[PDB]
Amino acid sequence: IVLDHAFGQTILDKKPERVATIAWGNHDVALALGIVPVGFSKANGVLPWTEEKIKELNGKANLFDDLDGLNFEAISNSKPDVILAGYSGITKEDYDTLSKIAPVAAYKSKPWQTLWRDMIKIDSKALGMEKEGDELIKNTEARISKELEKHPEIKGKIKGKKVLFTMINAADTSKFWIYTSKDPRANYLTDLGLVFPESLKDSFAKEISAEEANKINDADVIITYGDDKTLEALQKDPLLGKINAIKNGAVAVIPDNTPLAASCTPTPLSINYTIEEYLNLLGNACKNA
């Protein structure tokens, strides 16, 4: 197997008997394909849906201690035939260091800029299951499509609505992050029927000033990580409270440090697990748009 990526070409094992994954989501792609990794990146350490699939494949979860950074000794100790990194933020040196252990399936373009469909495409190809990658993508799309046609009143409230995904901190509202269309969590919203406003363009996210906030003023609905005081807080903000979607209360707050929060960057396993919960949260927010 030949694989082209941001760092060149990778000769991969057609039948990898031992699979390691790093970064976010990559393990879910392997797992959704019936492969239990010999080790995958510990999450901030396993999400409910990742555990559910591991159990269903009669496996156990082996975790790399990837919090402070890549654990090169851990990945090496698991003895992989392939390292899945289709969605990751690896640097040129990361790729080189990792390549001394096993062939690496890196992202195609730039760090942290891989849509959930491409993540499957790269990770499945690196496992010698490119055709099965097609089916996984199709099955995942079917799950999304049948959820929206299943609840036409939620579909009706959210379709056509312009949306921005943000990271806002109540501690500091002078600066906040906007996720771009190259970000998997933002682009996922377009799979749901939402659209991007005219003020979005590259990177996966960009810092913006609250003065530049009137550029985000053409969004119908806003999504951000937060808590039960987030919306009330943003409405109280001298500048951010003047924004359309915030003023209207059309803000979808994803509870920070919950499984729902992690699923925002979608995998076929996470989508299958949290889409009802995610649509319900979006549905109510878009009611205020």
Residue numbers in the entry: 40 to 83, 91 to 247, 253 to 340
Structure paper excerpt:
Pia system is responsible for the transport of hydroxamate siderophores such as ferrichrome and ferrioxamin B, whereas Piu system for the transport of heme from hemoglobin. The overall structure of PiaA is composed of an individual N-terminal and a C-terminal domain linked by an α-helix. The N- and C-terminal domains face each other to form a hydrophobic and plastic cleft.
The structures of Se-Met substituted apo-PiaA and ferrichrome-binding complex were subsequently solved at 2.7 Å and 2.1 Å, respectively, by molecular replacement. Each asymmetric unit of the apo-PiaA structure contains two molecules, which are quite similar to each other with an RMSD of 0.24 Å over 278 Cα atoms. Notably, Segments 1 and 2 are located at the N- and C-terminal domains, respectively, indicating the cooperativity between the two domains. Superposition of apo-PiaA and PiaA-B3P against the ferrichrome-complexed form gives an RMSD of 0.31 Å for 262 Cα atoms and 0.45 Å for 283 Cα atoms, respectively.
